[PDB]
């Protein structure tokens, strides 16, 4: 069945999915500049672009 799955491998497949979810979050955030606000919604705030 395309719409079916065996309940006896739920734990194994869920924790393999957790492994891939960790391995796709292996990066470093990079500094990408800022710009001083000109509209008065947030006074003096520097927003990342």
């Amino acid at each position: 069945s395309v719409r079916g799955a065996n309940p006896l491998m739920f734990r194994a497949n869920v924790l393999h999915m957790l492994l891939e979810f960790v391995l796709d979050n292996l990066y470093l955030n990079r500094h990408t500049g800022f710009s001083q606000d000109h509209t008065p919604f947030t006074e003096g705030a520097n927003l990342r672009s």
Binding site: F21, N25, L26, Y27, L28, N29, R30, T32
Partner: protein
């Protein structure tokens, strides 16, 4: 053994770090009789987070 493949350790993300998005499912009834459409911020094309 003589020369092995090097791994790619340093990888850089320039976007924003997240993993949980927010998705709408059913559209809100923006034309309705009991409340005029001038209440909603969708009528003025004010974008919302």
């Amino acid at each position: 053994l003589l020369h092995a493949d090097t791994p790619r350790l340093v990888t850089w993300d320039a976007g924003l770090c997240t993993s949980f998005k927010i998705v709408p499912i059913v559209p809100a009834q923006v034309p309705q009789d009991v409340l005029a459409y001038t209440f909603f911020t969708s009528s003025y094309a004010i974008q919302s987070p």
